[PDB]
Design a protein around this ligand. Structure first.
Ligand SMILES: Nc1ncnc2c1ncn2[C@@H]1O[C@H](COP(=O)(O)OP(=O)(O)OP(=O)(O)O)[C@@H](O)[C@H]1O
Ligand SMILES: O=C(O)/C=C(/CCc1ccc(Cl)cc1)c1ccccc1
Length: 285
């Protein structure tokens, strides 16, 4: 039996999207806390947003991994749709970057490793995220990552050995050159975004920065960026192996033989991959 709005006591708003509100809720029968994402049916129908909502449900239903926000249940009433999600108490990674300014090497390594571990799982299921960015990497009460925002994700079809997807989605600062030039994204598009994120953790800002999208696009396709002084040398090597225009030459992509070579990069020398989600994350700074 599907859950109903009356099964929950709703509390504070956790965040607002263009077409959605995420509210903290306690399930009355269990006292469990969920982040419940609510959308108005009329609104999403009028704004042609329905395939984003069905895409989110469909992609999240396939995922079962400690580094992703979990979809526990969905339900609907006359006016609304509801996603019952795990509550990431500590919110967006982005706000930590802003307040601290720049992660030290141990924190950069730890969070990068968790993102790499998440992407390995996601790509192993044939799913491209397409909107990987600090605002979409949430943190749970233990400060592990919880990647979210799957309305713009794509399940590639195994049956047709599908490698490329054609919807133009994502966030300008993290969009891959192939999406700008070839008008399609692939799993390697996420590794481009990973490179931007590692750079941002260390430098404080993502690498292709400008006051508007068009200027950012022009820089992306020219690979127009540089490192600040004091960028950790092993991180720099890794970023240069990810921010590569040719999508088939990025460390971790299928044509470069996958995640083994990525996980083996000297930047991750100290990392115990196997139990990341049970390790205590390093204290931020
Ligand atoms: N499981 C969760 N736990 C805690 N906070 C969450 C969770 N899911 C989302 N949030 C918060 O709610 C905000 C809004 O999320 P939502 O998915 O509704 O829209 P969005 O993706 O932020 O915006 P848009 O749809 O306009 O791109 C998020 O940015 C995040 O801060
Ligand atoms: O999963 C369900 O219980 C059913 C739906 C209903 C599918 C649907 C989609 C869009 C609209 Cl306008 C109406 C109904 C749902 C889909 C996504 C998120 C939450 C609930």
């Amino acid at each position: 039996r599907k859950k109903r709005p009356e099964d929950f006591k709703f509390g504070k708003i956790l965040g607002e999207g263009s077409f959605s509100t995420v509210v903290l809720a306690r399930e009355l029968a269990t006292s469990r806390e969920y982040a419940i994402k609510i959308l108005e049916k009329r609104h999403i129908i009028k704004e042609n947003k329905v395939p984003y909502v069905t895409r989110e449900r469909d992609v999240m239903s396939r995922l079962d991994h400690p580094f992703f926000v979990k979809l526990y249940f969905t339900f609907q009433d006359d006016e609304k749709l509801y996603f019952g999600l795990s509550y990431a108490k500590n919110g967006e990674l982005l706000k930590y970057i802003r307040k601290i300014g720049s992660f030290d090497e141990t924190c950069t390594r730890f969070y990068t490793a968790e993102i790499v571990s998440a992407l390995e799982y996601l790509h192993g299921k044939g799913i491209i995220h397409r909107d990987l960015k600090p605002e979409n990497i949430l943190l749970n009460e233990d400060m592990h990552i919880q990647i979210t925002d799957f309305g713009t994700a794509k399940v590639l079809s195994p049956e047709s050995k599908q490698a490329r997807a054609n919807s133009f989605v994502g966030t300008a600062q993290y969009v891959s050159p192939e999406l700008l030039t070839e008008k399609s994204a692939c799993k390697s598009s996420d590794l481009w975004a990973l490179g931007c994120i590692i750079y941002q953790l260390v430098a404080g800002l993502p690498p292709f920065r400008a006051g508007n999208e068009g200027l950012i696009f022009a820089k992306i396709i020219k690979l127009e960026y540089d490192f600040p002084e004091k960028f950790f040398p092993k991180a720099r090597d890794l970023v240069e192996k990810l921010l590569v225009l040719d999508a088939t030459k990025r460390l971790g992509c299928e044509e470069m033989e996958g995640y083994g070579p990525l996980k083996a990069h000297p930047f991750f020398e100290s990392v115990t991959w196997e139990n990341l989600h049970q390790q205590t994350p390093p204290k931020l700074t």
